[PDB]
Structure 1
Amino acid sequence: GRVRTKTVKKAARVIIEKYYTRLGNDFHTNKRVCEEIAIIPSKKLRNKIAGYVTHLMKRIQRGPVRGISIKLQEEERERRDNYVPEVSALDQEIIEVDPDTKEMLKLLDFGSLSNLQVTQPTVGMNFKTPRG
C-alpha cells in the first residue's frame, strides 16, 4: 500500500499553488526547489511531497484540477474556452413550429413570420409511461 496522506497531498497542493512558476515535470529539479522553499525536516517526506508535486504538475499542464487555484484558471477561460463557430447554431433557414406554437404566435403580435414551417400535427395521444 502506497497512499499519500493528507499532510503530503495538502502540502503539495499549497506548494504548487504558491510556486507554480518554479515547478515542472522533472522530479529531481523540484525536489531541490521544495527543499529550498519549504522546511521539511525529513528527506523521505520531502521525496513524497516532490513526487506528488510532479504528478499534480502533470495534471495541471494537461488540464484542470479541483484543489489548485493559481492565476492560470483566470486566463485559461479567455484563450481557448472562447471558441465560437463561424455560424451560430441558432441561425437556420427554417424553424419547425407546431400548430399550437403557431397559434400562440398568432395570439402574439408576431403574425407573419417569413422563415417558419408549421409541421404536421402529431396523431395519437400516447405519451405516458406504462405503469410498472
Structure 2
Amino acid sequence: GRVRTKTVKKAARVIIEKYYTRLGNDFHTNKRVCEEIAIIPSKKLRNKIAGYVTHLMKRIQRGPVRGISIKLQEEERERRYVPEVSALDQEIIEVDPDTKEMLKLLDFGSLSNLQVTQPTVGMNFKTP
C-alpha cells in the first residue's frame, strides 16, 4: 500500500499555500525546489513531499480543492457571467388566479404584462 501519511500530505499543502509562484507540474523541478523552501530531514520524505506536490498541482489547476485555501481564489482573481437578455425578462408570466386576487388586493394588476392560466381540477396532491 502506497498511501501517503499525515506529514507528507499536510506538509505538502502548507508548502503549497505559500511558495505557489515557484511550484509547477514537473516532479524534478519541485524536488529541487523543496530544499530552498524548507528544512526537511532525509530525502525519502523529500521525494514523497515532491510527489504529493506534483500530484496536487496535477489536481489543483482545474478547480477548487477542499483542503487548499483561497490563495486558489487569489489565482482565480488573477486568472479567472450574465446573458444578453435576462431570464427574468420574460414577456408572459403564467399566474394561477389566487395570485391574481392577491395582486388585485395589493393595488397592482391594472398593469398587464401577465397572463392568468386556467385553474386545476382535482386535489390529489398527497402520496398514498
TM-score norm. by structure 2 comes to 0.92
**Structure 1 range deviating more: 27-36 or 70-79:** 70-79
What is the alpha-carbon root mean square deviation over aligned residues? 1.6
Which aligned runs of 4 or more in structure 1 are off by greater than 3 angstroms?
77-80
Query: In structure 2, how many angstroms separate the alpha carbons of the residues matched to 1:14 and 1:105?
Result: 57
Q: Alpha-carbon deviation of 1:26?
A: 0.5
**Match of 2:118?**
120
Quick one: structure 1 residues 79 and 15, their matched pair in 2 at CA, closer, same or farther if it must change by over 3 Å?
closer
Q: Alpha-carbon deviation of 1:78?
A: 8.5
Would you say how many aligned residue pairs link Structure 1 and Structure 2? 128
Query: In structure 1, how many angstroms separate the alpha carbons of the residues matched to 2:8 and 2:93?
Result: 57
Query: In structure 2, how many angstroms separate the alpha carbons of the residues matched to 1:61 and 1:79?
Result: 11
Deviations 1:55-98 (A, max 9, x none): 11122211111111153404626864xx1111111000100100
SS in 2 for 1:37: coil
SS in 1 for 2:36: helix
Query: In structure 1, how many angstroms separate the alpha carbons of the residues matched to 2:112 and 2:124?
Result: 33
Quick one: structure 1 residues 87 and 68, their matched pair in 2 at CA, closer, same or farther if it must change by over 3 Å?
same
SS in 2 for 1:66: coil
Query: In structure 1, how many angstroms separate the alpha carbons of the residues matched to 2:29 and 2:18?
Result: 17
Deviations 1:24-45 (A, max 9, x none): 0000001010122111111011
Q: Alpha-carbon deviation of 1:113?
A: 2.9
